[PDB]
Design brief:
This is Serine protease 1. Keywords: Calcium, Digestion, Disulfide bond, Hydrolase, Metal-binding, Protease, Secreted, Serine protease, Signal, Zymogen. By secondary structure, this protein is mainly beta. The chain folds into 2 domains: 120 residues, Trypsin-like serine proteases (Thrombin, subunit H, Beta Barrel), CATH 2.40.10; 102 residues, Trypsin-like serine proteases (Thrombin, subunit H), CATH 2.40.10. Helices cover 7% and strands 32% of the residues. It has a 7-stranded antiparallel beta sheet with strand order 1-9-8-11-12-13-10. Strands 2-3-4-7-6-5 form a 6-stranded antiparallel beta barrel. The relative contact order is 0.23.
Length: 223
Amino acid sequence: IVGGYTCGANTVPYQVSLNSGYHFCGGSLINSQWVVSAAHCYKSGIQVRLGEDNINVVEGNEQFISASKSIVHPSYNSNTLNNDIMLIKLKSAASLNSRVASISLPTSCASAGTQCLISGWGNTKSSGTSYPDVLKCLKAPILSDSSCKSAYPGQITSNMFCAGYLEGGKDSCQGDSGGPVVCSGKLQGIVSWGSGCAQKNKPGVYTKVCNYVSWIKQTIASN
């Protein structure tokens, strides 16, 4: 997260870290046994870490649960990142509490201007790279359709939306992958892609979760 701020220990209970001997992506807890992330965050043997703040230090409130299966959307396009969503089922149900809680899926898409909360342990610099210990936050508004399409000419599909600041300086970055974009208590987006990080006219492009609610429900139910 570029230009964000320390969220504060477990102030984003639904935020999770995908681990492969190291943090490589973010994720959102949607129920005691399922996590929503980006399809580009796929890999075998992922270990989900819940209740994390300082990913470099075991603080005592974490729950490490191996993913029993990571299901990428059937229509995921690796080149464009169209349909960049993935469901991860936990080998076992997480113990939900004040530091480990799920986020509600949307029942309708968010309007331009809707301010959201984006979080993650990604790269904190727009040039080069520096990773934080604790979870970083960022309040960013959803960008209008036209401004989104102008920034990424012909690269924005209906399963994507922009959010951030066109003047740059504040944005998500590599490491935030799969992380949440919560607006009014609803997970409306997933950290997907973008041109650089925090560049002017190059805001974060996020997976439009509202478009995948039926798929998510259908996948969770038959798994």
